[PDB]
């Protein structure tokens, strides 16, 4: 044994791989059905699976179905998210095994 | 010296405050076409901007 | 629009989207929570201060 005494090879000392989890928890993500816009042209070519949009045109003689003026918003759950934080370093390397005073008087 | 021995003020301890990331993630959402109600009909007045249903 | 040709009327209303919306999100998940490490009753253990 020695005159002073400490917490280094063999002791209950502390530093240690942080870890930590987190509770489950419920994520919102709205997903706005206006704001689109348009883009490119008409009377030509058009992708698959298109949104359909109205341009406000009068019709003179058939009926707009396609078009029609939102009364109630629409309200949506997201998925899932993160769970918990990864490893990270503690204390210092060039700092490590660093001696402690304990001599008693 | 004393018989009591601490590292507060100037001394070569150990143990820091520990730092951490979370990975990615991405939130997705369905946009339903279902809920979004209904009000009066089509060839009428209509709001500027409105969501096309 | 499930790329349908009219058949007497004209579909101009419709057209393919070419630039990107922007949207709004709400606010997500920000950090974690305080969590239990090590266990108290063995932890800190007494060390033997005796001389040699």
Do not use: C, K
Not at 54 to 65: E, L
Not at 76 to 93: A, C, E, K, W
């Amino acid at each position: 044994a020695g005159g002073t005494g400490g917490r280094v090879f063999n002791t209950i000392r502390t530093e240690n791989v942080p870890l930590m989890t987190v509770n489950g928890s419920s994520f919102s993500l709205s997903s706005n059905t206006h704001s689109h816009n348009m883009v490119f042209g008409r009377g030509d070519a058009s992708g698959h699976n298109s949104s359909p949009n109205w341009y406000s045109p009068g019709g003179g003689y058939s009926q707009r179905t396609d078009n029609d003026t939102h009364t109630h918003t629409i309200s949506g759950s997201v998925s899932l998210g993160r769970d918990d934080i990864s490893r990270q370093p503690i204390n210092t390397l060039p700092p490590f095994r660093a001696a402690h005073i304990w001599r008693r008087i």
